[PDB]
Design a protein around this nucleic acid. Structure first.
Ligand SMILES: [Ca+2]
Ligand SMILES: [Ca+2]
Ligand SMILES: [Ca+2]
Length: 294
DNA sequence: CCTTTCCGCTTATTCAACCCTTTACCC
DNA sequence: GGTAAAGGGTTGAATAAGCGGAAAGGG
């Protein structure tokens, strides 16, 4: 039932997964607190099939709706988390997300030895939790810090499978219609982009060297910023990008976008993009891609 | 007989996707 | 001259991350 290649899956989890450690007030727990350790993926419902492919490839995880437009795969059963760990030991993450996995592995150790059933263990997990994802809430920071006391306190791209997973999460295949001082008054520019927060700047640099093309753009929106890896030089698209994903396939609905983008690349290589009829065929393809897909 | 697990649901922002202007390159 | 490539910029929602409530097997 191995619907998804394991490196593709590590790639897609580096893009979209999340490692969760909850420490909850519990009046009924001997220690005063209960714990939940989890791995999870939340996607738009149009990509349910990916989650079902993960779930059947791993044989763990519960699929459920998450709001009107999204679906989750959550793994919380403790012995099933051993499947998740074994996967990530064999096919390791490479983004900053690996730091969340490493903390996740440490909590798991605590919990395996049952120490989380004692206030000692809970405090160990609070320390683990403080650097994991968004850290401790105020209620929890406050419950475990006293007046006068102290406060609670990157790998290379392995292969194209990992890059196919990751792109299926964060990639964009875009046809750009540029107003131009050319005969037709429009230039067709193919754009491949991968977008990521600058905490992963070094991954972005590795994309340029791994693929042999492209460049990084610094993007800004008020107080928030991020990066894009971008490729538009047509010979690199044709000779580096397209063939890579033709061998190592994009998963989900994005596959249909990559198939359309490739159809435009064909028109471009035949020069039909410099014709009025070739142009209107590109327009029709573009409008039913991405946001415009029905 | 406490503790694990599931379930429905919510929130902030890092993503994806989008467009326009300028410069570089080469039958 | 005419096309390709790169520079320069935006937006809204699909992600990430994680809440509260409760089912259920268990002395
Ligand atoms: Ca991501
Ligand atoms: Ca995505
Ligand atoms: Ca994403």
């Amino acid at each position: 039932n191995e619907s998804i290649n394991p490196w593709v899956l590590t790639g897609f989890a580096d893009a979209e997964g999340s490692f969760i450690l909850r420490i909850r007030n519990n009046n009924k727990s001997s220690a005063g607190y209960s714990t939940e350790l989890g791995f999870q993926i939340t996607l738009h419902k149009k990509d349910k099939s990916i989650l079902e492919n993960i779930q059947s490839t791993w044989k763990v995880g519960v699929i459920a709706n998450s709001g009107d437009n999204a679906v989750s795969l959550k793994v919380t059963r403790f012995e099933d988390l051993r499947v998740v760990l074994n996967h990530f030991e064999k096919y390791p993450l490479i983004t900053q997300k690996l730091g969340d996995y490493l903390l996740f592995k440490q909590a798991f150790s605590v919990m395996e030895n049952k120490e989380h059933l004692k206030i000692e263990g809970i405090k160990r997990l609070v320390g683990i939790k403080a650097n994991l994802n968004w850290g401790l809430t105020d209620e929890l920071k406050e419950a475990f810090v006293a007046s006068g006391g102290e406060n609670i306190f990157n790998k290379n791209i392995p292969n194209s499978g990992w890059l196919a997973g990751f792109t299926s999460g964060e990639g964009c295949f875009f046809v750009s219609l540029i107003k131009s001082k050319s005969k037709l008054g429009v230039q067709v520019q193919l754009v491949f982009s991968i977008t990521q927060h600058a905490r992963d700047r070094e991954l972005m640099d590795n994309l340029v060297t791994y693929l042999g093309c492209g460049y990084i753009k610094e993007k800004k929106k008020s107080e928030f910023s991020w990066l894009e890896f971008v490729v538009t030089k047509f010979s690199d698209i044709k000779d580096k990008i397209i063939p890579v994903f033709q061998e190592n396939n994009i998963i989900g609905v994005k596959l249909e976008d990559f198939e359309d983008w490739c159809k435009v690349a064909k028109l471009i290589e035949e020069k039909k993009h410099l014709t009025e009829s070739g142009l209107e065929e590109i327009r029709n393809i573009k409008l039913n891609m991405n946001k415009g897909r029905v």
